[PDB]
């Protein structure tokens, strides 16, 4: 993880 | 300037080329990009709760179209790529890449300049939607928090959560007290409100949480009546029932998670995905060996102990009906 979103 | 020249000048990796092409084809914005300078900038930064140390640095390093042409090109188009989706929650949150720190303070604070340059457009959107000034400002103050987070995490000034600020800047997320709510839809297109918890504002007291929940429907039904959500949806390490092993009854997270109805399957024990989420939020983890991490709070000890035991934390997803 470590990235975010939300897609 | 051309996208390939920008890419090479800023030291951007080749994968960004597609983005840069999109931006090149999009072009500069109709309203030309304007950065606030000097005391105008200090006052705006202050209003946005950016700490004084960072604000002073942001103002000092503000880039210039002539000296920083590649950076400036990207600033205009990145601003444009955001405002073209004003009010549009169906578009993906693309804030653009972080700039390599070899470009200095202007590169480190790039997305702060994007945010600053975009404040007038989102505040116009706020007014058209009849959003109260204090709600609009309170929402945008998360910039200060995210700037402060970068410094704690990495040790110098910056703001590398630009994917997240696309929500504030498109006018699709609002802080309503302790909690934030975003215009969202599920996979089947049914409207809901996405819930998020800013770091700043103190503990998640039940009374504070409750007040925010009470504010959600009246706010969105007034200003976004076409939306019509009935339910809030959250995905978080905080919804992981495994926390009950380690946190006591006076834990705010434990008391509040009890209201939630989890909708995902019990995760595979070996799925290590939620680890990076809990590590980010509890420690602002940046690759340091687990032994060096602080152990002052019950949660800090819990995250590490669980990991040391060969076990994993999971992001869980659920909903609460809006009052
Ligand atoms: C949201 C937040 C304010 C909740 O704090 P809270 O209301 O104090 O939560 P609890 O009452 O459940 O805390 C239980 C214990 O864990 C500690 N704790 C809670 N959140 C913590 C965090 N992010 N980092 C370190 N310790 C934390 C508390 O200090 C408390 O310790 P104690 O038992 O030694 O007194 C806090 O976790 C936070 O700021 N997190 C960052 C934002 C975040 O996680 N957002 C959502 C991501 S999906
Ligand atoms: C996701 O990341 C951004 C940037 O780091 C943060 O600002 C958000 O706060 C994070 N999202 C998250 O907050 C989801 C929260 C769902 C909450 C579920 C209810 C909790 C009740 C205990
Ligand atoms: C992230 O995206 C999904 C799918 O569109 C949505 O269900 C969820 O609520 C979104 N989260 C936020 C915080 O908007
Ligand atoms: C989810 O997938 C999108 C594209 O589908 C990526 O941009 C994102 O980084 C994450 O992998």
SS3 letters across B211-270: HHHHHHHHHHHHHCCCCCCCEEEEEEHHHCHHHHHCCCCCCHHHHHHCCCEECCCCCCCC
Numbered residues of the known binding site of B: 182, 192, 197, 204, 237, 251-253, 281, 298, 300
Closest residue to B194, CB basis, from A3, A4, A6: A6
Residue closest via CA to ligand 1's atom 23 equals B282
Distance of CA B80 to the CA centre of its chain: 19
Answer for the pair B193, B145: CB distance below 8 angstroms, yes or no. no
Answer for the pair B179, B201: CB distance below 8 angstroms, yes or no. no
Residue closest via CA to ligand 3's atom 10 equals A6
The residue to which tokens 């000097």 are assigned: B38
Q: From the CA of B124, how far away is ligand 3's center (Å)?
A: 24
Ligand 4 contact, A1 CB (< 6 A): no
The β-bridge partners of B191 are B185
C-alpha to C-alpha distance for B154 and B174, rounded to whole angstroms: 28
Residue closest via CA to ligand 3's atom 12 equals B194
Q: What is the resolution of this structure in A?
A: 2.0
- Both structure tokens of B69: 């042409």
Dihedral in degrees, nearest 10, Cα atoms B270, B273, B277, B279: 50
| CA atoms B275, B316, B231, B251: torsion sign | negative
In angstroms and rounded to an integer, the radius of gyration of the C-alpha atoms of chain B is 21
Q: What is the 3-state secondary structure (H, E, C) of chain B?
A: CCHHHHHHHHCCCHHHHHHHHHHHHHCCCCCCCCCCCHHHHHHHHHHCCCCHHHHHHHHHHCCCCCCCHHHHHHHHHHHHHHHCCCCCCCCCCCCCCCCCHHHHHHHHCHHHHHHHHHHHHHHHHHHHCCCCHHHHHHHHCHHHHHHHHHHHHHCCCCCCCHHHHHHHHCCCEEEECCEEEEEEECCCCCEEEEEECCCCCCCCCHHHHHHHHHHHHHHHHHHCCCCCCCEEEEEEHHHCHHHHHCCCCCCHHHHHHCCCEECCCCCCCCCCCHHHHHHHHHHCCCCCCHHHCCCCCHHHHHHHHHHHCCCCCCCEEEEEECC
Distance of CA B229 to the CA centre of its chain: 22
Q: From the CA of B185, how far away is ligand 3's center (Å)?
A: 7
Angle at B207 between CA B219 and CA B133, to 5 degrees: 35
| CA atoms B162, B164, B165, B167: torsion sign | positive
Domains in chain B, please, with CATH?
1-172 (no CATH), 173-323 (3.40.630.120)
Answer for the pair B180, B147: CB distance below 8 angstroms, yes or no. no
Distance of CA B102 to the CA centre of its chain: 24
Q: From the CA of B239, how far away is ligand 4's center (Å)?
A: 23
CA distance to partner chain A, nearest, from residue B29 (Å): 25
CA distance to partner chain A, nearest, from residue B313 (Å): 12
Length of chain B: 323
| CA atoms B246, B248, B253, B254: torsion sign | positive
CA distance to partner chain A, nearest, from residue B43 (Å): 30
Which 8-state DSSP code applies to residue A1? -
Ligand 2 contact, B239 CB (< 6 A): yes
What's the order of all strands across the beta sheet hosting B191-196?
A: B173-176, B179-185, B191-196, B231-236, B316-321, B261-262
Number of H helices, E strands in chain A: 0, 0
CB atoms < 10 A from the CB of A7, how many? Answer: 5
Answer for the pair B246, B309: CB distance below 8 angstroms, yes or no. no
Burial class (CB in 10 A: 0-12, 13-18, 19+), B124: middle
The β-bridge partners of B183 are B193
What backbone phi and psi angles, to 5 degrees, belong to B195? Answer: -100, 140
Burial class (CB in 10 A: 0-12, 13-18, 19+), B8: exposed
Beta-strand relationship, B191-196 and B231-236 = parallel
The residue to which tokens 């930064």 are assigned: B45
C-alpha to C-alpha distance for B13 and B109, rounded to whole angstroms: 19
**What method was applied to determine this entry?**
X-ray
All residues of chain A having their beta carbon less than 8 Å from the beta carbon of residue B276 are: 1-2
Which 8-state DSSP code applies to residue A4? -
Residue closest via CA to ligand 4's atom 2 equals A7
DSSP three-state, residue A2: coil
């Amino acid at each position: 993880x470590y990235x975010x979103x939300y897609x | 300037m051309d996208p390939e020249t920008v890419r090479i000048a800023l030291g951007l990796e080749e994968r960004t080329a597609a983005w840069l092409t999109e931006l090149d084809e999009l072009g500069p914005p109709a309203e030309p990009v304007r950065l606030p300078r000097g005391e105008e900038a200090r006052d705006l930064l202050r209003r946005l709760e950016v700490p004084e140390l960072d604000a002073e640095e942001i103002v000092a390093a503000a880039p210039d179209p002539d000296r920083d042409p590649a950076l400036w090109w990207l600033l205009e188009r990145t601003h444009h790529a955001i405002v073209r989706h004003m009010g549009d929650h169906r578009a993906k949150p693309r804030g653009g890449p972080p700039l390599p720190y070899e470009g200095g303070a202007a590169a480190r604070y790039f997305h702060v300049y994007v945010f600053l340059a975009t404040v007038p457009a989102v505040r116009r959107f706020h007014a058209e939607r009849g959003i109260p000034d204090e709600v609009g400002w309170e929402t945008l103050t998360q910039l200060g928090e995210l700037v402060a987070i970068h410094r704690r995490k990495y040790g110098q000034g910056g703001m590398n959560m630009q994917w997240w600020t696309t929500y504030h800047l498109r006018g699709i997320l609002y802080r309503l007290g302790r909690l934030q709510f975003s215009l969202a839809t599920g996979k089947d297109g049914t409207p809901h409100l996405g819930l998020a918890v800013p770091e700043w504002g103190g503990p998640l007291l039940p009374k504070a949480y409750d007040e925010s929940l009470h504010r959600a429907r009246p706010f969105f039904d007034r200003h976004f009546p076409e939306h019509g959500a009935r339910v809030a949806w959250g995905s978080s390490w905080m919804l992981d029932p495994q926390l009950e092993e380690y946190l006591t009854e006076d834990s705010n997270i434990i008391q509040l998670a009890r209201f939630w109805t989890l909708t995902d399957s019990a995760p595979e024990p070996g799925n290590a995905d939620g680890d990076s989420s809990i590590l980010e939020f509890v420690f602002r983890y940046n690759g340091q060996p687990l032994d060096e991490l602080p152990q002052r709070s019950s949660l800090e000890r819990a995250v590490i102990a669980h990991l040391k035991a060969g076990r994993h934390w999971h992001m869980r997803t659920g909903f609460v009906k809006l009052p």
